[PDB]
Design a protein around this ligand. Structure first.
Ligand SMILES: CC(=O)N[C@@H]1[C@@H](O)[C@@H](O)[C@@H](CO)O[C@@H]1O
Ligand SMILES: CC(=O)N[C@@H]1[C@@H](O)[C@@H](O)[C@@H](CO)O[C@@H]1O
Ligand SMILES: CC(=O)N[C@@H]1[C@@H](O)[C@@H](O)[C@@H](CO)O[C@@H]1O
Ligand SMILES: [Ca+2]
Ligand SMILES: [Ca+2]
Ligand SMILES: [Ca+2]
Ligand SMILES: [Cl-]
Ligand SMILES: [Cl-]
Lengths: 252, 252, 252
């Protein structure tokens, strides 16, 4: 139950330099492998930089706030090149960048194919993150994956709002349980059925021997609207009631 | 009124293998065309794989939940290569992947340039989606587009919250319609004017010959704040009232 | 306090044509520079088109609504090629595209390395934006950056909702300040502590010599739930009260 970010095409990648396009970030996913034909080159089984120094990197980013729980790195699949240590940097706001664990130099790879995995406890909370190779065998060449928490069912909800009143004397007389319905139409139709939350912002009602009785509920909710059922009981005379409603659509 | 996803640069793409960088996913949009100069190669008018088998794919992804309504595929513009059938797979959570229509093998292209379009009824609801070529003429080479519903006006709203009370005896005496205003300042200024929803969470008020009368409304809403107007009428003495407010900014 | 979009890997890029993959959009960030080795080509210090006409472009996009505040362009770092003027187009819905400032032809570069910056007042509000070169020295070749407002702390909140009542006669007798607590468990645990907004949707209560007194508040809020404290005072007998709650989690 972690998300493989690169495997799912969830992040944009950007390297400092590329040896050429046949060594670009597009070739960098963990376990990347291509044709084992030696007579025709189809690209490195890695990102490989052009410049060899301590200033190269790949940035991975997108708009969403991610909770990164691990990173895995690997050397290059088709030649003896691998990153032996690296630093990490990240940003939540895309303005201020932070050094992971005070600029910790993480021990990394020692061969082409063995995976080295570092776990983040607590998760790194970030929009963008950058791997910064510090040392290497032969060339700055790597494959990698970033692991994040899945998105919660409750995130990114859609919302519409409005108000509803009795607007007449429908509940202003009589005895026992008495109800009226006001049908509400959402300004725009939802793609799935929302929930509808309500809160009273006007009471104009008479007590019944000192007892106040009123209720509202949302019912019969559809993509297009819902019913506000206004309720009184005993012998209360309710002159008017008003609710604000907040309709919330999830997972869409 | 559908959105052309690749045309709008809305999705990250990732292929299994590329013949080389000059045949990568960057060349895969429907109707992609480049220089018709035969003396200098500027890349294939297609994505083309490196390995030829039944295991190649392109994944298209981003963080947002998309409602995919169609897919179009095409062969390669500058050579006789095209995909003749394919399967589709998708994921909503980026953990669990689903086979489209029980692993349906979709009949696809028979030439370089004719478009073949499949419509999804109901839409495929997904964060990432993958085209998996099964058979081909000459090479696994294609162009394509994914079509999605546009984003609703009501999605991804911004929210700020707080509470407001009378806090004094301003409405606790007198006759007829009586009102007071409490100006509220949002903790942070909005980029556009929000709506402001309210709900009562405290009443401390005297009836007027048994009649209860109170109201709140939000008014004079700006990017910076709003006015909670507290209202009573008849001869009611209102000691205190409290509302929670929810301010919602759309389309920003 | 603006965000450098390409530097942070925040946008997908898509060109009309590329001279080849070694001249693609991946080489287009402002101040892009690679190996100054003349004996081995590692790609142009620019995006460069393949076709030379007035119809080439790069589209930059993602799902989020961005407020673009500036654009900077530069020519090519390693050869005498630069764009001398261009037009801009953008879209908020990814269906309807708009010409910036009525199709204004913007004066651009006159050398390899000097930066030319245009500021947008008001910001361009858009999901995708496209630079459309009109004239050029030698070739359509450029580097660039797009600048946007940072995301507000209040955007993309997570939400859960529910209702809570006294459900018994706990507050229906006695004298002075009397309170009861109902512990509420969120259907799903949050990653950080939310706020909890409330609004009354049922009153069943007796006045005390004509005075109505009731209150609710949310307290002891955690990732897992909160306490609704129901309150009365004086000599009021409260039979039942019901609140809808809206719990909002920010910045996650
Ligand atoms: C069924 C019915 O009317 N029930 C009410 C109850 O809700 C409450 O208001 C009470 C106050 O003494 O009076 C009655 O028992
Ligand atoms: C204008 C005015 O005071 N209107 C009120 C009305 O709102 C309601 O409370 C009624 C109850 O009998 O008493 C009056 O008519
Ligand atoms: C402490 C206490 O009971 N205060 C109350 C106050 O809240 C209000 O209801 C008032 C009405 O005359 O009666 C008392 O003073
Ligand atoms: Ca190979
Ligand atoms: Ca060509
Ligand atoms: Ca160079
Ligand atoms: Cl009364
Ligand atoms: Cl009341």
């Amino acid at each position: 139950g972690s998300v493989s970010c690169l495997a799912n095409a969830l992040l944009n990648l950007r390297s400092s330099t590329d040896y050429n396009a046949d060594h670009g970030v597009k070739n960098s996913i963990l376990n990347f492998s291509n044709s084992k034909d030696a007579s025709r080159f189809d690209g490195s089984e890695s990102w490989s930089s052009s410049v060899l120094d301590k200033n190269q990197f790949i940035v991975a980013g997108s708009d969403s706030v991610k909770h990164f729980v691990a990173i895995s790195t690997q050397g290059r699949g088709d030649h003896d090149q691998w990153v032996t240590s690296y630093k990490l940097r990240y940003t939540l706001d895309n303005v201020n960048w932070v050094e992971y664990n005070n600029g910790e130099i993480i021990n990394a790879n020692k061969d082409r194919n063995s995976i080295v995995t570092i776990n983040f406890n607590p998760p790194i909370k970030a929009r963008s993150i950058a791997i910064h190779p510090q040392t290497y065998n032969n060339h700055i060449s790597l494959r990698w994956e970033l692991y994040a928490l899945p998105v919660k069912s409750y995130s990114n909800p859609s919302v519409q709002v409005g108000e509803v009143s009795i607007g007449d004397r429908s509940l202003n007389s009589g005895t026992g349980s008495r109800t009226i319905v006001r049908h509400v139409k959402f300004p725009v139709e939802f793609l799935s059925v929302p929930i509808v939350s309500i809160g009273c912002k006007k009471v104009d009602a008479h007590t019944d021997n000192g007892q106040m009785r009123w209720e509202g509920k949302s019912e019969n909710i559809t993509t297009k609207g819902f019913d506000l059922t206004f309720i009184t009981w005993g012998n209360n005379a309710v002159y008017d009631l008003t609710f604000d409603y907040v309709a919330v659509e999830f997972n869409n």
